[PDB]
């Protein structure tokens, strides 16, 4: 898999 | 302390008499959590990843305890797949990236 | 480096002979750039974020140089609206949680 947050 | 990167950077985090835990974020503007105890009336709120954009809870002034260090901020309630805690909460307790 | 928190840990790298930016993600499991070109060949991988599934085009053993620290690894690249250094590139340069 996972990539994360805007 | 000192965390190494081998594996997800999860930590103890309390929030409403509930341990749960969460990914230390360095890529999220903001802490989103998958459910949270029964906190209250939310905010709409819209965030953004990398496969497009979510509609969030937004939760204020939440008290949270991340490795027993104490903090104080917007918690966002989202379909995240793992629970992170993003910058908003990273500043507070004093966490910096190393290399 | 130490890098503080108080707005997005934005680097630069160098990767295939380009100097662009990127954003250090400890929540991210792998690197993943916006469209480029890299020698060798590809083959296709999903990655889940916020916001669902990108299809990505995953290069191994690519080199990367992030503030001047070598590092040798998997290159994911595909539709990402920023481009992100995950762990497996950060435990590569040594880069480390503090707090
Ligand atoms: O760059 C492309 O043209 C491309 C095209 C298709 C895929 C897929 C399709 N798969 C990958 C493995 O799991 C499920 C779906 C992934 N990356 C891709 C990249």
Same mark, same amino acid.
């Given at each position: 898999?996972?990539?994360?947050?805007? | 302390?000192?965390?190494?990167?081998?594996?997800?950077?999860?930590? %103890?985090?309390?929030?409403?008499?509930?341990?749960? #835990? *969460?990914?230390?974020?360095?890529? *999220?503007?903001?802490?989103?959590? #998958? #459910?949270?105890?029964?906190?209250?009336?939310?905010?709409?709120?819209?965030? @953004? @990843?990398?496969?497009?954009?979510?509609?969030?809870?937004?939760?204020?002034?939440?008290?949270? #305890?991340? $490795? @027993?260090?104490?903090?104080?901020? %917007?918690?966002?309630?989202?379909? %995240?797949?793992?629970?992170?805690? @993003?910058?908003?909460?990273?500043?507070?307790?004093? $966490? %910096?990236?190393?290399?």
């Amino acid at each position: 898999x996972v990539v994360x947050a805007x | 302390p000192q965390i190494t990167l081998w594996k997800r950077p999860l930590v %103890t985090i309390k929030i409403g008499g509930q341990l749960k #835990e *969460a990914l230390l974020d360095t890529g *999220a503007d903001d802490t989103v959590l #998958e #459910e949270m105890n029964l906190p209250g009336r939310w905010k709409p709120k819209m965030i @953004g @990843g990398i496969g497009g954009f979510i509609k969030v809870r937004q939760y204020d002034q939440i008290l949270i #305890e991340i $490795c @027993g260090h104490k903090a104080i901020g %917007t918690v966002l309630v989202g379909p %995240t797949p793992v629970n992170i805690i @993003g910058r908003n909460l990273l500043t507070q307790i004093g $966490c %910096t990236l190393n290399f």
